[PDB]
Amino acid sequence: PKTVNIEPGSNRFLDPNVEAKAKDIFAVPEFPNKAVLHNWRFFIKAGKAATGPPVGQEFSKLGLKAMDFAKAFNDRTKPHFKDDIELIVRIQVYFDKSYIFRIEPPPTAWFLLRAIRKKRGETGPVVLRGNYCAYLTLEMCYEIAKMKQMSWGKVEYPPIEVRVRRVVGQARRMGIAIIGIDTVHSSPVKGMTEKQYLEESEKHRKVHMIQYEALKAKELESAPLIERLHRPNMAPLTNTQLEEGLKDANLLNALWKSSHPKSLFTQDTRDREMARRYLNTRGWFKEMTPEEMRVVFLNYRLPKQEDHQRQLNMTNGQAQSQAYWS
Partner 1 sequence: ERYYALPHLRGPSMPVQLAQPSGKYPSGKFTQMMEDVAIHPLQKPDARYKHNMYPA
Partner 2 sequence: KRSGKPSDLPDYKQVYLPYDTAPTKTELDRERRKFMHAYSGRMEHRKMVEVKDVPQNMYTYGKEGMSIPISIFKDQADPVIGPEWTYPGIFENKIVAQHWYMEELFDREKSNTFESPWQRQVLDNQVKRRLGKVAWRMSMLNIKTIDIFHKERGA
Residues in region 245-274 near partner 1 by CB under 8 A? 246-249, 252
Nearer to partner 1, 227 or 291 (CB): 227
Which of 160, 155, 159, 158 shows the shortest CA–CA distance to 143?
160
* Min separation Cβ 80 and partner 1, Å: 39
Angle of helix 108-116 versus helix 160-172 axis, rounded to 10:
70
Q: Which does 138 bind (CB under 5 to 8 A by kind): partner 2, partner 1, none?
A: partner 2
Strand 36-39 relative to strand 42-44: parallel, antiparallel, unpaired? unpaired
Q: Which does 248 bind (CB under 5 to 8 A by kind): partner 1, partner 2, none?
A: partner 1
Facing residues of 44 across strands? Answer: 87
Q: Which does 16 bind (CB under 5 to 8 A by kind): partner 2, partner 1, none?
A: none
Nearer to partner 2, 97 or 218 (CB): 218
Q: Which does 252 bind (CB under 5 to 8 A by kind): partner 1, partner 2, none?
A: partner 1
- Between residue 305 and residue 324, which ones bind partner 1 under the rule CB under 8 A? none
Nearer to partner 1, 194 or 243 (CB): 243
Nearer to partner 2, 32 or 169 (CB): 169
Nearer to partner 2, 41 or 277 (CB): 41
Please report, as a single letter, which amino acid is at residue 20: A
For the stretch 31-38, contacts whose Cβ atoms lie closer than 8 Å and that sit 24 or more positions apart, written own/partner, are: 31/100, 32/94, 32/100, 34/94, 34/95, 34/96, 34/98, 35/94, 35/95, 36/92, 36/93, 36/94, 36/95, 37/93, 37/94, 37/95, 37/97, 38/62, 38/91, 38/92, 38/93
Q: Which does 86 bind (CB under 5 to 8 A by kind): partner 1, partner 2, none?
A: partner 2
For the stretch 57-64, contacts whose Cβ atoms lie closer than 8 Å and that sit 24 or more positions apart, written own/partner, are: 62/38, 62/93, 62/97, 64/97, 64/99
Q: Which does 126 bind (CB under 5 to 8 A by kind): partner 1, partner 2, none?
A: partner 2
Q: Which does 247 bind (CB under 5 to 8 A by kind): partner 2, partner 1, none?
A: partner 1
Contact status, residue 51 vs residue 67, Cβ threshold 8 Å: yes
Does the footprint of partner 1 cover residue 109 (CB under 8 A)? no
- Reported as type and span, the H/E element at residue 80 is none
- Between residue 226 and residue 245, which ones bind partner 1 under the rule CB under 8 A? 243
Give SS3 for 273: helix
Nearer to partner 1, 108 or 259 (CB): 259
Nearer to partner 2, 27 or 323 (CB): 27
* Min separation Cβ 208 and partner 2, Å: 5
Q: Give the x/- contact pattern for partner 1 in 190-229, rule: CB under 8 A.
A: ----------------------------------------
Give SS3 for 298: coil
Strand 42-44 relative to strand 99-104: parallel, antiparallel, unpaired? unpaired
Residue numbers after which the chain is interrupted (C to N above 2.5 A) read: none
Binding site for partner 1 (CB under 8 A): 243, 246-249, 252
